[PDB]
Amino acid sequence: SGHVSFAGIDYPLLPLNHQTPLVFQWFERNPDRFGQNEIPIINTQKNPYLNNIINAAIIEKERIIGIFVDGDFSKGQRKALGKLEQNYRNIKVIYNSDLNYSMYDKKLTTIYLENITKLEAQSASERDEVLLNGVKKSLEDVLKNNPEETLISSHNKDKGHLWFDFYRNLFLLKGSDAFLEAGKPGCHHLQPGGGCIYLDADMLLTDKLGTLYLPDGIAIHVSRKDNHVSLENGIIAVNRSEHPALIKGLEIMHSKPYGDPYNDWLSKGLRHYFDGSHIQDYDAFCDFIEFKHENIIMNTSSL
Numbered sequence: 001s002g003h004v005s006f007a008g009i010d011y012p013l014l015p016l017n018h019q020t021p022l023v024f025q026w027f028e029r030n031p032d033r034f035g036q037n038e039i040p041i042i043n044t045q046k047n048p049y050l051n052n053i054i055n056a057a058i059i060e061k062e063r064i065i066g067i068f069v070d071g072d073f074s075k076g077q078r079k080a081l082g083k084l085e086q087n088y089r090n091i092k093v094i095y096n097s098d099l100n101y102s103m104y105d106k107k108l109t110t111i112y113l114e115n116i117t118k119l120e121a122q123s124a125s126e127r128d129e130v131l132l133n134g135v136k137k138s139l140e141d142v143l144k145n146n147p148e149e150t151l152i153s154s155h156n157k158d159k160g161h162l163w164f165d166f167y168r169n170l171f172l173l174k175g176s177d178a179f180l181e182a183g184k185p186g187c188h189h190l191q192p193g194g195g196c197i198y199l200d201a202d203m204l205l206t207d208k209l210g211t212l213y214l215p216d217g218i219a220i221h222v223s224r225k226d227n228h229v230s231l232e233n234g235i236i237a238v239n240r241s242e243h244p245a246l247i248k249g250l251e252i253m254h255s256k257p258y259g260d261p262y263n264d265w266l267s268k269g270l271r272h273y274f275d276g277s278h279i280q281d282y283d284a285f286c287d288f289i290e291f292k293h294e295n296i297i298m299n300t301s302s303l
Ligand SMILES: O=c1ccn([C@@H]2O[C@H](COP(=O)(O)OP(=O)(O)O)[C@@H](O)[C@H]2O)c(=O)[nH]1
Pocket: 024, 025, 026, 027, 028, 029, 047, 164, 199, 200, 201, 202, 299, 301, 302
């Protein structure tokens, strides 16, 4: 079609054409279980992820493919990627540290003390003292820990899947203009403030994707098992840099102690923007926001 309507509000279908890079990501918790001249990206029987990205890139030789990487990498491991970039020159390896996220950041001192004030400003006969006393100990712990400790820093390699699911959302905020910001070659063909398409390393390209259309230019993976639907970070595709729905999620991260990429940023951000006030069912959002493509065998890590 040409559009779709949700909550009584109308939403046009926006193009994501074959310029639009596929993004993969690998945040490797440990680099030293790899050879120091091995591409520090996992390619094993249960998940041969390094095979699923190349084959993706081969199926799409004339669309850019980004590999969003992060980990304390040996010089030789960085040149394993280097060989990978010249041996296939649509592939663009991008180091997390080569991007500046300061414009999207916040200090937990700030974030906590905000909530401390909000709660203390409410009726004592109404307020969440249980929470009121947790954010102050979180406060108590960050002071002693480190004055200038922020959201972005917190969600570190130590913090497991919050490491890579947090920075993912940041990446997409920066979108296609991030190929430029690290300095990656032969990316002049990317449009400004342009979108991207993240992929779990395990969503398998089979055949060409083509030119995607979305409600307001955003879609995400939705799980459907067996009797269940969820929204997933397995696929994320936007049509531009700093899409609002994710922007709102970045705000909810700034305005909540203990925000979470999955529940707060991704999930509630999308849905508050799309459904600020909850007129449509959750599922009827999941359907409205679902990313459909027949040429990808979705989320093959469950097998
Ligand atoms: O050590 C890891 C493990 C996972 N991932 C990311 O998590 C995504 C999906 O992970 P997987 O399918 O293995 O786990 P699931 O979330 O499906 O259980 C991958 O594409 C990666 O982007 C990562 O960056 N580093």
